[PDB]
Design an enzyme around this catalytic site. Sequence first.
Site, PDB file in Angstrom:
ATOM      1  N   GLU A   1     -30.252  33.373  21.852  1.00 51.46           N
ATOM      2  CA  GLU A   1     -30.889  32.173  22.719  1.00 51.46           C
ATOM      3  C   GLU A   1     -30.789  32.561  24.125  1.00 51.46           C
ATOM      4  O   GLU A   1     -29.956  33.368  24.763  1.00 51.46           O
ATOM      5  CB  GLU A   1     -30.072  31.093  22.499  1.00 51.46           C
TER       6      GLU A   1
ATOM      7  N   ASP B   1     -29.963  31.648  17.357  1.00 56.72           N
ATOM      8  CA  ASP B   1     -29.021  31.528  18.511  1.00 56.72           C
ATOM      9  C   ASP B   1     -28.341  32.796  18.476  1.00 56.72           C
ATOM     10  O   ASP B   1     -27.969  33.097  19.919  1.00 56.72           O
ATOM     11  CB  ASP B   1     -28.317  30.276  18.838  1.00 56.72           C
TER      12      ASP B   1
ATOM     13  N   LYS C   1     -31.965  20.287  11.020  1.00 62.14           N
ATOM     14  CA  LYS C   1     -32.187  21.920  11.134  1.00 62.14           C
ATOM     15  C   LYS C   1     -32.142  22.609   9.909  1.00 62.14           C
ATOM     16  O   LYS C   1     -33.144  23.735   9.819  1.00 62.14           O
ATOM     17  CB  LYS C   1     -30.778  22.210  11.889  1.00 62.14           C
TER      18      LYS C   1
HETATM   19  O1  LIG Z   1     -31.316  24.158  18.749  1.00 64.96           O
HETATM   20  C1  LIG Z   1     -31.689  24.567  19.939  1.00 64.96           C
HETATM   21  N1  LIG Z   1     -32.520  23.346  20.644  1.00 64.96           N
HETATM   22  C2  LIG Z   1     -33.052  23.413  21.647  1.00 64.96           C
HETATM   23  C3  LIG Z   1     -33.206  22.112  22.164  1.00 64.96           C
HETATM   24  C4  LIG Z   1     -34.537  21.878  22.745  1.00 64.96           C
HETATM   25  C5  LIG Z   1     -34.840  20.224  23.245  1.00 64.96           C
HETATM   26  C6  LIG Z   1     -33.759  19.521  23.407  1.00 64.96           C
HETATM   27  C7  LIG Z   1     -33.856  18.142  23.915  1.00 64.96           C
HETATM   28  N2  LIG Z   1     -32.901  17.160  24.291  1.00 64.96           N
HETATM   29  N3  LIG Z   1     -33.698  16.206  24.706  1.00 64.96           N
HETATM   30  N4  LIG Z   1     -34.915  16.380  24.725  1.00 64.96           N
HETATM   31  N5  LIG Z   1     -35.315  17.718  24.285  1.00 64.96           N
HETATM   32  C8  LIG Z   1     -32.273  19.844  22.868  1.00 64.96           C
HETATM   33  C9  LIG Z   1     -32.422  21.359  22.651  1.00 64.96           C
HETATM   34  C10 LIG Z   1     -33.500  24.629  22.208  1.00 64.96           C
HETATM   35  C11 LIG Z   1     -34.155  24.840  23.379  1.00 64.96           C
HETATM   36  C12 LIG Z   1     -35.885  25.083  23.146  1.00 64.96           C
HETATM   37  C13 LIG Z   1     -36.298  24.778  21.900  1.00 64.96           C
HETATM   38  C14 LIG Z   1     -37.677  25.116  21.595  1.00 64.96           C
HETATM   39  C15 LIG Z   1     -38.595  25.482  22.651  1.00 64.96           C
HETATM   40  C16 LIG Z   1     -37.998  25.472  24.004  1.00 64.96           C
HETATM   41  C17 LIG Z   1     -38.859  25.781  25.150  1.00 64.96           C
HETATM   42  C18 LIG Z   1     -38.415  25.534  26.185  1.00 64.96           C
HETATM   43  C19 LIG Z   1     -37.124  25.710  26.616  1.00 64.96           C
HETATM   44  C20 LIG Z   1     -36.186  25.377  25.590  1.00 64.96           C
HETATM   45  C21 LIG Z   1     -36.677  25.305  24.096  1.00 64.96           C
HETATM   46  C22 LIG Z   1     -33.099  25.844  21.307  1.00 64.96           C
HETATM   47  C23 LIG Z   1     -32.322  25.657  20.194  1.00 64.96           C
HETATM   48  O2  LIG Z   1     -31.877  26.702  19.368  1.00 64.96           O
HETATM   49 MN   LIG Z   2     -30.119  26.090  18.588  1.00 64.39          MN
HETATM   50 MN   LIG Z   3     -32.161  28.889  19.855  1.00 62.99          MN
END
Ligand SMILES: O=c1[nH]c(-c2ccc(-c3nnn[nH]3)cc2)c(Cc2cccc3ccccc23)cc1O
Ligand SMILES: [Mn+2]
Ligand SMILES: [Mn+2]
Length: 200
Positions: A85, A113, A139
Amino acid sequence: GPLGSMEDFVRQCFNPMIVELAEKAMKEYGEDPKIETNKFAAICTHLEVCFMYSDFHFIDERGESIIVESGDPNALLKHRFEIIEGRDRIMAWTVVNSICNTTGVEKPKFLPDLYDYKENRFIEIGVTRREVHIYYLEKANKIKSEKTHIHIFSFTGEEMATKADYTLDEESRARIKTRLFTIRQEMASRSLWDSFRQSE
Ligand SMILES: O=c1[nH]c(-c2ccc(-c3nnn[nH]3)cc2)c(Cc2cccc3ccccc23)cc1O
Ligand SMILES: [Mn+2]
Ligand SMILES: [Mn+2]
Ligand SMILES: [Mn+2]
Protein backbone atom coordinates in the site's frame (compact mmCIF):
# COMPACT_ATOMS: atom_id res chain seq x y z
CA GLY A 1 -18.07 24.01 19.09
CA PRO A 2 -17.17 25.37 15.65
CA LEU A 3 -17.03 23.01 12.68
CA GLY A 4 -13.52 22.60 11.33
CA SER A 5 -12.49 21.57 7.86
CA MET A 6 -11.56 17.95 7.32
CA GLU A 7 -8.79 19.07 4.95
CA ASP A 8 -7.25 21.14 7.73
CA PHE A 9 -7.49 18.14 10.09
CA VAL A 10 -5.79 15.85 7.56
CA ARG A 11 -2.92 18.22 6.89
CA GLN A 12 -2.44 19.09 10.55
CA CYS A 13 -2.72 15.59 11.96
CA PHE A 14 -1.10 13.17 9.48
CA ASN A 15 2.59 13.10 8.63
CA PRO A 16 3.28 15.02 5.37
CA MET A 17 4.47 11.86 3.61
CA ILE A 18 1.21 10.06 4.39
CA VAL A 19 -0.79 13.08 3.22
CA GLU A 20 1.24 13.31 0.03
CA LEU A 21 0.89 9.63 -0.85
CA ALA A 22 -2.89 9.78 -0.24
CA GLU A 23 -3.18 13.03 -2.26
CA LYS A 24 -1.24 11.71 -5.25
CA ALA A 25 -3.25 8.48 -5.37
CA MET A 26 -6.63 10.22 -5.19
CA LYS A 27 -5.58 12.68 -7.90
CA GLU A 28 -4.45 9.95 -10.28
CA TYR A 29 -7.80 8.28 -9.65
CA GLY A 30 -9.77 11.41 -10.68
CA GLU A 31 -10.93 12.14 -7.11
CA ASP A 32 -10.20 15.57 -5.66
CA PRO A 33 -8.98 15.41 -2.03
CA LYS A 34 -10.24 19.00 -1.61
CA ILE A 35 -13.79 17.71 -2.26
CA GLU A 36 -13.78 14.06 -1.15
CA THR A 37 -12.30 15.02 2.18
CA ASN A 38 -13.85 12.29 4.31
CA LYS A 39 -12.38 9.81 1.84
CA PHE A 40 -9.07 11.71 2.01
CA ALA A 41 -8.96 11.27 5.80
CA ALA A 42 -9.99 7.58 5.59
CA ILE A 43 -7.25 6.85 3.01
CA CYS A 44 -4.70 8.60 5.21
CA THR A 45 -5.88 6.65 8.26
CA HIS A 46 -5.66 3.31 6.42
CA LEU A 47 -2.21 4.10 5.04
CA GLU A 48 -1.02 5.10 8.51
CA VAL A 49 -2.34 1.84 9.98
CA CYS A 50 -0.37 -0.05 7.29
CA PHE A 51 2.81 1.77 8.30
CA MET A 52 2.15 1.32 12.02
CA TYR A 53 1.51 -2.40 11.52
CA SER A 54 4.96 -2.73 9.99
CA ASP A 55 6.82 -0.29 12.28
CA PHE A 56 9.51 -1.70 14.56
CA HIS A 57 9.12 -5.32 13.42
CA PHE A 58 12.28 -7.07 12.22
CA ILE A 59 13.61 -10.55 11.58
CA ASP A 60 16.76 -11.03 13.63
CA GLU A 61 20.16 -12.52 12.74
CA ARG A 62 18.72 -15.96 13.62
CA GLY A 63 15.42 -15.49 11.76
CA GLU A 64 13.06 -14.87 14.72
CA SER A 65 10.70 -11.87 14.82
CA ILE A 66 11.80 -9.10 17.21
CA ILE A 67 10.62 -5.60 18.05
CA VAL A 68 13.12 -2.73 17.91
CA GLU A 69 11.66 0.69 18.74
CA SER A 70 14.98 2.47 19.39
CA GLY A 71 16.47 4.54 16.59
CA ASP A 72 19.11 2.04 15.50
CA PRO A 73 18.01 -1.40 14.29
CA ASN A 74 21.25 -3.36 14.06
CA ALA A 75 22.42 -3.55 10.45
CA LEU A 76 21.81 -7.31 10.07
CA LEU A 77 18.10 -7.14 10.95
CA LYS A 78 15.60 -7.42 8.12
CA HIS A 79 12.25 -5.61 8.04
CA ARG A 80 9.58 -8.16 8.88
CA PHE A 81 7.01 -6.69 6.46
CA GLU A 82 6.97 -5.47 2.91
CA ILE A 83 4.61 -2.50 2.47
CA ILE A 84 2.61 -2.66 -0.76
CA GLU A 85 0.00 0.00 0.00
CA GLY A 86 1.04 3.52 -0.82
CA ARG A 87 2.92 2.59 -4.00
CA ASP A 88 1.66 3.43 -7.42
CA ARG A 89 0.16 0.48 -9.30
CA ILE A 90 3.28 -0.32 -11.34
CA MET A 91 5.59 -0.36 -8.34
CA ALA A 92 3.07 -2.22 -6.20
CA TRP A 93 2.72 -5.09 -8.67
CA THR A 94 6.49 -5.06 -9.25
CA VAL A 95 6.98 -5.63 -5.51
CA VAL A 96 4.26 -8.28 -5.38
CA ASN A 97 5.95 -10.10 -8.28
CA SER A 98 9.34 -9.87 -6.59
CA ILE A 99 7.93 -11.29 -3.33
CA CYS A 100 6.23 -14.17 -5.07
CA ASN A 101 9.52 -15.02 -6.82
CA THR A 102 11.63 -14.74 -3.67
CA THR A 103 9.21 -16.72 -1.48
CA GLY A 104 7.13 -18.82 -3.90
CA VAL A 105 3.85 -17.61 -2.34
CA GLU A 106 1.09 -17.46 -4.91
CA LYS A 107 0.24 -14.18 -6.55
CA PRO A 108 -2.88 -12.36 -5.31
CA LYS A 109 -5.69 -11.17 -7.55
CA PHE A 110 -5.84 -7.66 -6.05
CA LEU A 111 -3.05 -5.68 -4.48
CA PRO A 112 -2.85 -6.45 -0.79
CA ASP A 113 -1.41 -4.05 1.79
CA LEU A 114 1.55 -5.91 3.34
CA TYR A 115 3.61 -9.06 3.04
CA ASP A 116 4.68 -10.80 6.28
CA TYR A 117 8.06 -12.50 5.87
CA LYS A 118 7.65 -14.40 9.16
CA GLU A 119 4.18 -15.85 8.54
CA ASN A 120 4.82 -16.02 4.76
CA ARG A 121 1.57 -14.46 3.66
CA PHE A 122 0.10 -11.26 2.24
CA ILE A 123 -2.11 -9.18 4.55
CA GLU A 124 -5.16 -7.07 3.69
CA ILE A 125 -5.63 -4.29 6.25
CA GLY A 126 -9.05 -2.78 6.80
CA VAL A 127 -10.11 0.19 8.92
CA THR A 128 -13.81 0.77 9.40
CA ARG A 129 -16.32 3.04 11.09
CA ARG A 130 -19.02 0.32 10.81
CA GLU A 131 -19.23 -3.15 12.37
CA VAL A 132 -16.06 -5.15 11.85
CA HIS A 133 -17.81 -8.42 11.05
CA ILE A 134 -19.79 -6.91 8.18
CA TYR A 135 -16.68 -5.14 6.93
CA TYR A 136 -14.67 -8.37 7.31
CA LEU A 137 -17.09 -10.35 5.13
CA GLU A 138 -17.10 -7.67 2.45
CA LYS A 139 -13.30 -7.77 2.25
CA ALA A 140 -13.21 -11.57 2.27
CA ASN A 141 -15.82 -11.73 -0.48
CA LYS A 142 -13.99 -9.18 -2.64
CA ILE A 143 -10.62 -10.91 -2.58
CA LYS A 144 -11.29 -14.52 -1.47
CA SER A 145 -7.62 -15.17 -2.15
CA GLU A 146 -7.86 -17.55 0.84
CA LYS A 147 -4.14 -17.19 1.36
CA THR A 148 -4.23 -13.42 1.93
CA HIS A 149 -4.71 -12.83 5.63
CA ILE A 150 -7.32 -10.20 6.56
CA HIS A 151 -6.95 -7.92 9.58
CA ILE A 152 -9.72 -5.38 10.34
CA PHE A 153 -9.54 -2.52 12.81
CA SER A 154 -12.33 -0.20 13.88
CA PHE A 155 -12.22 3.20 15.53
CA THR A 156 -13.56 1.78 18.85
CA GLY A 157 -10.98 -0.93 19.52
CA GLU A 158 -12.72 -3.89 17.90
CA GLU A 159 -10.64 -6.09 15.60
CA MET A 160 -11.30 -9.10 13.45
CA ALA A 161 -8.66 -11.21 11.80
CA THR A 162 -8.63 -14.33 9.66
CA LYS A 163 -8.91 -17.52 11.71
CA ALA A 164 -8.66 -15.48 14.95
CA ASP A 165 -4.94 -15.16 14.13
CA TYR A 166 -3.89 -11.58 14.95
CA THR A 167 -0.24 -11.70 13.70
CA LEU A 168 1.09 -9.01 16.07
CA ASP A 169 1.44 -8.78 19.86
CA GLU A 170 -1.10 -6.84 21.91
CA GLU A 171 1.20 -3.82 22.42
CA SER A 172 1.61 -3.21 18.66
CA ARG A 173 -2.11 -3.55 18.07
CA ALA A 174 -2.74 -1.25 21.03
CA ARG A 175 -0.55 1.44 19.42
CA ILE A 176 -2.73 1.21 16.32
CA LYS A 177 -5.95 1.27 18.34
CA THR A 178 -4.75 4.19 20.45
CA ARG A 179 -3.96 6.13 17.26
CA LEU A 180 -7.42 5.38 15.83
CA PHE A 181 -8.98 6.54 19.09
CA THR A 182 -6.95 9.76 18.90
CA ILE A 183 -8.09 10.38 15.33
CA ARG A 184 -11.74 9.86 16.23
CA GLN A 185 -11.46 12.06 19.31
CA GLU A 186 -9.80 14.93 17.45
CA MET A 187 -12.33 14.71 14.61
CA ALA A 188 -15.07 14.83 17.25
CA SER A 189 -13.56 17.91 18.93
CA ARG A 190 -13.63 19.61 15.50
CA SER A 191 -17.21 18.35 14.95
CA LEU A 192 -15.98 16.36 11.92
CA TRP A 193 -16.69 12.88 13.25
CA ASP A 194 -20.42 12.67 12.50
CA SER A 195 -19.98 13.36 8.78
CA PHE A 196 -16.90 11.12 8.72
CA ARG A 197 -18.49 8.08 10.40
CA GLN A 198 -21.67 8.08 8.32
CA SER A 199 -19.69 8.72 5.10
CA GLU A 200 -18.60 5.06 4.88
O1 LIG B 1 -8.51 -1.30 2.44
C1 LIG B 1 -8.22 -0.36 1.73
N1 LIG B 1 -9.07 0.73 1.72
C2 LIG B 1 -8.84 1.83 0.94
C3 LIG B 1 -9.91 2.81 1.16
C4 LIG B 1 -10.63 3.38 0.08
C5 LIG B 1 -11.65 4.30 0.35
C6 LIG B 1 -11.96 4.63 1.70
C7 LIG B 1 -13.05 5.57 1.97
N2 LIG B 1 -13.59 5.93 3.16
N3 LIG B 1 -14.60 6.82 2.88
N4 LIG B 1 -14.74 7.02 1.62
N5 LIG B 1 -13.78 6.25 0.99
C8 LIG B 1 -11.24 4.03 2.78
C9 LIG B 1 -10.23 3.13 2.50
C10 LIG B 1 -7.74 1.97 0.11
C11 LIG B 1 -7.50 3.15 -0.69
C12 LIG B 1 -7.87 3.03 -2.14
C13 LIG B 1 -8.51 1.91 -2.59
C14 LIG B 1 -8.89 1.79 -3.95
C15 LIG B 1 -8.61 2.79 -4.83
C16 LIG B 1 -7.96 3.97 -4.36
C17 LIG B 1 -7.67 5.03 -5.27
C18 LIG B 1 -7.04 6.15 -4.85
C19 LIG B 1 -6.68 6.27 -3.49
C20 LIG B 1 -6.95 5.26 -2.60
C21 LIG B 1 -7.59 4.08 -3.01
C22 LIG B 1 -6.81 0.88 0.06
C23 LIG B 1 -7.06 -0.21 0.85
O2 LIG B 1 -6.33 -1.31 0.94
MN1 LIG C 1 -6.49 -2.34 2.85
MN1 LIG D 1 -4.46 -1.58 -0.13
MN1 LIG E 1 15.60 -0.10 7.76
